[PDB]
Structure 1
């Protein structure tokens, strides 16, 4: 939370409260959102219903192969044929 995806603490050997469980980069890609910096998931250009709410319109889900993130879809677009006398 609250990271610009560049100030992520990469550590040298031990300088973090985290007990050496860090994943560095380029393994599962890096995504920048308003909520913070997301790693472990791959962003896609599609749109589905929200499954795991991340925030700021970003959700995540596990497809069947890995965990991916996307933007929630509000619904199916529809149009009404309005007319003068129909």
Structure 2
């Protein structure tokens, strides 16, 4: 339970080999969070990978839609 990160020595947190969204940022890519219960430190994850099926004669056209309502708060 002693991890060496590019930002310092993190003692008390269990290093893992997964990658989730950031909960508590530490630095240089590492983020820590309370999960299976102990504190873990994992490399940050930028989002689920995807690969658009590009082809020179293929197009995708929506057949349906949603109406969404979002909230934006400004001082």
Measured against the shorter chain, the TM-score band is: 0.7 to 0.9
Aligned to 2:48: 76
Q: Structure 2 unaligned segments of length 5 or more: list them.
A: 59-75
Normalised TM-score (structure 2)? 0.74
User: More strand per residue: 1 or 2?
Assistant: 2
1:23 corresponds to which residue? none
Aligned to 1:30: 2
Summarize the Cα distance change of 1:44–1:52 in structure 2 as closer, same or farther, 3 Å threshold. Answer: same
For the aligned residues, what is the CA RMSD? 0.9
Could you tell me how far 1:83 is from its partner in structure 2? 0.7
The Cα of 1:36 is off from its aligned counterpart by 0.5
Q: How many pairs does the alignment contain?
A: 58
For structure 1, the 5+ residue unaligned runs are 1-28
* Aligned mates of 1:74, 1:64 — CA distance in 2: 21
TM-score w.r.t. length of structure 1:
0.65
